[PDB]
Amino acid sequence: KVFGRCELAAAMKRHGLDNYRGYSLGNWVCAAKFESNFNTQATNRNTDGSTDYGILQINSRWWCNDGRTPGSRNLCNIPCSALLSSDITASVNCAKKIVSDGNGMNAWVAWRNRCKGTDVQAWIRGCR
Numbered sequence: 001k002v003f004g005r006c007e008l009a010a011a012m013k014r015h016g017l018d019n020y021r022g023y024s025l026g027n028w029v030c031a032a033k034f035e036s037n038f039n040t041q042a043t044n045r046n047t048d049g050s051t052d053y054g055i056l057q058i059n060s061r062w063w064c065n066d067g068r069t070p071g072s073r074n075l076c077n078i079p080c081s082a083l084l085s086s087d088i089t090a091s092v093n094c095a096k097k098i099v100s101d102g103n104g105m106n107a108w109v110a111w112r113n114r115c116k117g118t119d120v121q122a123w124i125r126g127c128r
């Protein structure tokens with residue numbers, strides 16, 4: 001599913017991401033924009049053999065099981081395919097674990113390089 005901007009904001013807000021660990025909703029929408037262009041079926045194969053999955057491009061080395069990332073963990077205790085669903089619940093709850101790592105949203109390269117420090121509030125402009 002390719003979400004609309006405010007459609008994703010509403011789903012992320014309903015799922016509690018607005019100011020989660022201090023990160024305003026716009027930060028999460030911005031991260032999803034640049035990680036996946038709002039597409040739940042986004043994937044990217046990395047150099048190390050891991051794969052990033054879903055609207056927030058969550059990685060199989062630590063967070064989900066795809067059966068093809070040797071030596072990896074499954075800390076969110078989900079198949080990586082669950083991160084591709086139209087329903088973003090699994091991606092959101094796994095992201096909450098990630099952002100609690102200690103490095104916050106810096107875990108998302110696209111957030112650090114394209115959202116951090118910018119006017120992230122624009123990403124929820126006009127939404128209810």
Ligand SMILES: O=C1C(Br)=CC(=C(c2cc(Br)c(O)c(Br)c2)c2ccccc2S(=O)(=O)O)C=C1Br
Nearest residue numbers: 010011012013014015016017020089092093096
């Ligand atoms: O006592 C509660 C009550 Br009541 C609600 C909630 C949640 C919730 C709340 C709202 Br409101 C909502 O719109 C959605 Br969707 C889920 C929730 C449930 C499962 C997983 C994550 C959440 S989380 O989103 O809170 O992380 C958790 C506890 Br504990």
Ligand code: NA
Nearest residue numbers: 060064072073
């Ligand atoms: Na894994």
